[PDB]
Motif scaffolding. Structure first.
Motif, PDB file in Angstrom:
ATOM      1  N   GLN A 234      52.661  11.937  26.305  1.00  0.00           N
ATOM      2  CA  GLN A 234      51.475  11.090  26.133  1.00  0.00           C
ATOM      3  C   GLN A 234      51.121  11.079  24.653  1.00  0.00           C
ATOM      4  N   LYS A 235      50.350  10.075  24.232  1.00  0.00           N
ATOM      5  CA  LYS A 235      49.806   9.989  22.857  1.00  0.00           C
ATOM      6  C   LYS A 235      48.773  11.070  22.608  1.00  0.00           C
ATOM      7  N   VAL A 236      48.781  11.619  21.399  1.00  0.00           N
ATOM      8  CA  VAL A 236      47.778  12.595  20.971  1.00  0.00           C
ATOM      9  C   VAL A 236      46.544  11.821  20.531  1.00  0.00           C
ATOM     10  N   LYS A 237      45.357  12.312  20.888  1.00  0.00           N
ATOM     11  CA  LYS A 237      44.122  11.780  20.306  1.00  0.00           C
ATOM     12  C   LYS A 237      43.946  12.366  18.910  1.00  0.00           C
ATOM     13  N   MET A 238      43.751  11.493  17.929  1.00  0.00           N
ATOM     14  CA  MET A 238      43.588  11.926  16.543  1.00  0.00           C
ATOM     15  C   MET A 238      42.221  12.545  16.355  1.00  0.00           C
ATOM     16  N   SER A 239      42.152  13.609  15.564  1.00  0.00           N
ATOM     17  CA  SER A 239      40.894  14.320  15.348  1.00  0.00           C
ATOM     18  C   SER A 239      40.996  15.202  14.105  1.00  0.00           C
ATOM     19  N   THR A 240      39.928  15.925  13.789  1.00  0.00           N
ATOM     20  CA  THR A 240      39.936  16.961  12.733  1.00  0.00           C
ATOM     21  C   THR A 240      41.068  17.987  12.937  1.00  0.00           C
ATOM     22  N   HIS A 241      41.533  18.111  14.173  1.00  0.00           N
ATOM     23  CA  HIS A 241      42.517  19.130  14.550  1.00  0.00           C
ATOM     24  C   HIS A 241      43.923  18.613  14.817  1.00  0.00           C
ATOM     25  N   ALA A 242      44.081  17.294  14.932  1.00  0.00           N
ATOM     26  CA  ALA A 242      45.362  16.646  15.178  1.00  0.00           C
ATOM     27  C   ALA A 242      45.459  15.336  14.392  1.00  0.00           C
ATOM     28  N   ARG A 243      46.309  15.318  13.352  1.00  0.00           N
ATOM     29  CA  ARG A 243      46.619  14.094  12.612  1.00  0.00           C
ATOM     30  C   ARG A 243      48.061  14.076  12.125  1.00  0.00           C
ATOM     31  N   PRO A 244      48.646  12.889  11.914  1.00  0.00           N
ATOM     32  CA  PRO A 244      49.987  12.869  11.337  1.00  0.00           C
ATOM     33  C   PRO A 244      49.937  13.357   9.887  1.00  0.00           C
ATOM     34  N   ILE A 245      50.994  14.001   9.420  1.00  0.00           N
ATOM     35  CA  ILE A 245      51.179  14.220   7.954  1.00  0.00           C
ATOM     36  C   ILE A 245      51.726  12.925   7.348  1.00  0.00           C
ATOM     37  N   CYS A 246      51.528  12.651   6.052  1.00  0.00           N
ATOM     38  CA  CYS A 246      52.178  11.454   5.472  1.00  0.00           C
ATOM     39  C   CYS A 246      53.651  11.723   5.194  1.00  0.00           C
ATOM     40  N   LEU A 247      54.492  10.759   5.554  1.00  0.00           N
ATOM     41  CA  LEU A 247      55.892  10.769   5.168  1.00  0.00           C
ATOM     42  C   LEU A 247      56.103   9.867   3.951  1.00  0.00           C
ATOM     43  N   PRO A 248      56.852  10.364   2.961  1.00  0.00           N
ATOM     44  CA  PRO A 248      57.138   9.570   1.760  1.00  0.00           C
ATOM     45  C   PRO A 248      57.983   8.356   2.171  1.00  0.00           C
ATOM     46  N   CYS A 249      57.999   7.318   1.340  1.00  0.00           N
ATOM     47  CA  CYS A 249      58.790   6.119   1.617  1.00  0.00           C
ATOM     48  C   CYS A 249      58.237   5.293   2.762  1.00  0.00           C
ATOM     49  N   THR A 250      56.945   5.458   3.035  1.00  0.00           N
ATOM     50  CA  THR A 250      56.247   4.584   3.977  1.00  0.00           C
ATOM     51  C   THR A 250      55.111   3.868   3.272  1.00  0.00           C
ATOM     52  N   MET A 251      54.673   2.740   3.825  1.00  0.00           N
ATOM     53  CA  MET A 251      53.511   2.034   3.219  1.00  0.00           C
ATOM     54  C   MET A 251      52.215   2.864   3.268  1.00  0.00           C
ATOM     55  N   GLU A 252      52.045   3.669   4.329  1.00  0.00           N
ATOM     56  CA  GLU A 252      50.869   4.563   4.433  1.00  0.00           C
ATOM     57  C   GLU A 252      50.809   5.604   3.288  1.00  0.00           C
ATOM     58  N   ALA A 253      51.941   6.249   3.018  1.00  0.00           N
ATOM     59  CA  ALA A 253      52.060   7.150   1.871  1.00  0.00           C
ATOM     60  C   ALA A 253      51.862   6.421   0.542  1.00  0.00           C
ATOM     61  N   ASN A 254      52.423   5.232   0.409  1.00  0.00           N
ATOM     62  CA  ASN A 254      52.226   4.448  -0.807  1.00  0.00           C
ATOM     63  C   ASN A 254      50.746   4.222  -1.122  1.00  0.00           C
ATOM     64  N   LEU A 255      49.979   3.892  -0.092  1.00  0.00           N
ATOM     65  CA  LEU A 255      48.530   3.678  -0.252  1.00  0.00           C
ATOM     66  C   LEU A 255      47.812   4.991  -0.588  1.00  0.00           C
ATOM     67  N   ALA A 256      48.138   6.060   0.139  1.00  0.00           N
ATOM     68  CA  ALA A 256      47.599   7.394  -0.139  1.00  0.00           C
ATOM     69  C   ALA A 256      47.834   7.787  -1.570  1.00  0.00           C
ATOM     70  N   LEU A 257      49.013   7.457  -2.091  1.00  0.00           N
ATOM     71  CA  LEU A 257      49.385   7.816  -3.456  1.00  0.00           C
ATOM     72  C   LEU A 257      48.844   6.834  -4.518  1.00  0.00           C
TER      73      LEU A 257
END
Ligand SMILES: *[C@@H]1O[C@H](CO)[C@@H](O[C@@H]2O[C@H](CO)[C@@H](O)[C@H](O)[C@H]2NC(C)=O)[C@H](O[C@@H]2O[C@H](CO)[C@@H](O)[C@H](O)[C@H]2NC(C)=O)[C@H]1NC(C)=O
Ligand SMILES: *[C@@H]1O[C@H](CO)[C@@H](O[C@@H]2O[C@H](CO)[C@@H](O[C@@H]3O[C@H](CO)[C@@H](O)[C@H](O)[C@H]3NC(C)=O)[C@H](O)[C@H]2NC(C)=O)[C@H](O)[C@H]1NC(C)=O
Ligand SMILES: *[C@@H]1O[C@H](CO)[C@@H](O)[C@H](O)[C@H]1NC(C)=O
Ligand SMILES: *[C@@H]1O[C@H](CO)[C@@H](O)[C@H](O)[C@H]1NC(C)=O
Ligand SMILES: [Mg+2]
Length: 490
Positions: free
Chosen positions: A314-337
């Protein structure tokens, strides 16, 4: 608290006391603290405008929330750095009332420009932070300005979240605690006035001023920076795999780990230190992985292609205790950086791993964040070379690169921590612009300190500890084969 959430807008007003009782050096500490709070606030990708006002006898507005530049981090930090203490040289008294009335005037101007009745105006939450010694001595009681602000903002019991006022004396200076306490909001279960020795201490308190509890989208590489937060709050991507190994959440259903680990996956959960159990829908193990691939030729264990993906049932509910780490070479990481739109994977590798020795981390069995230094370029060669002393696992090693291939990052030199066997599969990660990026995963090493307690190798203990981590920048074709519709690759 200052709320960090997707709905609405946050106006933050930073009021810096440039009166005579604050030396030029104190003021620099104020500017340093203000810059950190701006940097941190902009790290969550939320809708935020920042005002900057310096004050003594009279306030000076360096950035207004009416200005579009107030929503641009670079313009904000620049207005901050362009703040001169001597601009108040002819009115060096402390008119805190007038500083707060400057905010009031800005709020009046903004309401007028947007419309009292519009959601554009009503959706704004307002956070005022005064950096001051709290020694107001002219201009009348600041409460008048506070009460005007509460009025224009229609702060009722239902709208208590729409206003927070903080008063913080940061630095070595003499502070009037009674005035700071009087300036700050009075909210049950929270503090709004602080006396802090330095920007370092402010960084800690600021983490506790932010309420991130309602940030539940899949934003990557967000964590808690407080030494007083839980281990899981500090590294919410961290998972334990019970096939023990560790892994990293990389989306709300996928976990990255080591192939050699191969069920239950334990994920962070805000309701207990014990996390939450997930079953596995699918495991994808790299077909290149074969730990005994070289055994018959005298390399008894070989960790090439040591990578695996787990899809949770099942999908994890995102929270203070569960979030993805950023992976390099993605648009999400590009924005973070905060890097250019058309950046490539090579650009992200340059961004993150430019130095010959790069401070990085992995997570211990007990949840603690430990420190390592990744060694790049010429230092990678020296770092890796010591495998040539490991004659028992590698009795037939003609070239270092037969075991330490270009697929591996290297660390474990000098005072580095070295991963234990059960820490395998966990992220090797770095922090940049208050966001977290996975550059590798724990694979193998020459010394197991756990074989809460870790032993150091004796300085004589041939070979010395050294640790080899699958390099995510070298695994792009495989990651893309499997996650092309999960993550948004550059
Ligand atoms: C010691 O390691 C070396 C380096 O891998 C092996 O020699 C290599 O073997 C490959 C083919 O397996 C060959 O193409 C390379 O030229 C050769 N490299 C070097 C530097 O010589 C050894 O492998 C054993 O030695 C002979 C002679 O090269 C091989 O032909 C043979 O296949 C192999 N012996 C067997 C039957 O295992 C390796 N030594 C041992 C004892 O495994
Ligand atoms: C780093 O982690 C900290 C420790 O968890 C966070 O601080 C916690 O923030 C929570 C959210 O604001 C507080 O939650 C509760 O909210 C309820 C209702 O909305 C209030 O009534 C409660 O008073 C409050 N908790 C209780 C029962 O007292 C936590 O109080 C608070 N804990 C502490 C020790 O400060 C930080 O926010 C977090 N920072 C970041 C950037 O992630
Ligand atoms: C302070 O007053 C003097 C005399 O009027 C003036 O020359 C100077 O520019 C003033 N300083 C500032 C920052 O305005
Ligand atoms: C977790 O392990 C680290 C590293 O050895 C140790 O410093 C720390 O004391 C441990 N934490 C706990 C809960 O004891
Ligand atoms: Mg003063």
């Amino acid at each position: 608290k200052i709320q960090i959430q997707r709905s609405g807008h946050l106006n933050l007003y930073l009021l810096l006391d440039a009166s005579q009782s604050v030396s030029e050096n104190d003021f620099l500490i104020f500017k340093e603290s203000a810059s950190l709070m701006v940097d941190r606030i902009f790290s969550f990708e939320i809708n935020v405008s920042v005002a900057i006002i310096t004050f003594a006898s009279e306030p000076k507005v360096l950035m207004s929330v009416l200005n579009d530049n107030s929503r641009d981090m670079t313009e904000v930090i620049s207005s901050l750095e362009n703040a001169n203490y001597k601009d108040h040289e002819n009115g060096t008294g402390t008119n805190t009332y007038a500083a707060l009335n400057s905010v009031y005037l800005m709020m009046n101007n903004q309401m007028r420009l947007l419309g009292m009745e519009t959601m554009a105006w009503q959706e704004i939450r307002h956070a005022i932070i005064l950096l001051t010694d709290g020694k107001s001595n002219m201009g009348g009681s600041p409460k008048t300005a506070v009460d005007h602000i509460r009025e224009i903002l229609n702060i009722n019991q239902k709208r208590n979240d729409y206003l927070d006022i903080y008063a913080i004396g940061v630095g070595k200076l003499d502070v009037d605690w009674r005035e700071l306490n009087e300036l700050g909001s009075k909210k049950d279960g929270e503090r709004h006035a602080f006396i802090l020795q330095d920007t370092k201490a402010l960084h800690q308190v600021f983490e506790h001023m932010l309420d991130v509890s309602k940030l539940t989208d899949t934003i990557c590489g967000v964590g808690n920076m407080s030494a007083n937060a839980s281990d899981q709050e500090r590294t919410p991507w961290h998972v334990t795999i019970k096939p023990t190994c560790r892994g990293a959440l990389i989306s709300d259903q996928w976990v990255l780990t080591a192939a050699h680990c191969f069920w239950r996956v334990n994920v962070g959960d805000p309701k207990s230190q014990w996390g939450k159990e997930f079953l596995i829908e699918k495991a994808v193990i790299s077909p290149g992985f074969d730990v005994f691939a070289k055994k018959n030729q005298g390399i008894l264990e070989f960790y090439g292609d040591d990578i695996a993906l787990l899809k949770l049932a099942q999908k994890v509910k995102m929270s203070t205790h569960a979030r993805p780490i950023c992976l390099p070479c993605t648009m999400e990481a590009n924005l973070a950086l905060r890097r250019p739109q058309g950046s490539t994977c090579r650009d992200h590798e340059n961004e993150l791993l430019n130095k010959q020795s790069v401070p990085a981390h992995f997570v211990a069995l007990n949840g603690s964040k430990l420190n390592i230094n990744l060694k790049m370029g010429v230092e990678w060669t020296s770092c890796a070379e010591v495998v040539s002393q490991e004659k028992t696992m590698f009795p037939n090693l003609t070239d270092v690169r037969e075991v330490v291939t270009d697929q591996f990052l290297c660390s474990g030199t000098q005072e580095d921590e070295s991963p234990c066997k059960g820490e395998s599969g966990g992220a090797v990660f770095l922090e940049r612009r208050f966001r977290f990026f996975q550059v590798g995963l724990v694979s193998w090493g020459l010394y197991n300190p756990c074989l809460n307690s870790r032993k150091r190798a004796p300085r004589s203990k041939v070979p010395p500890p050294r640790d080899f981590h699958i390099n995510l920048f070298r695994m792009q074709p495989w990651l893309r084969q499997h996650l092309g519709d999960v993550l948004n690759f550059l």
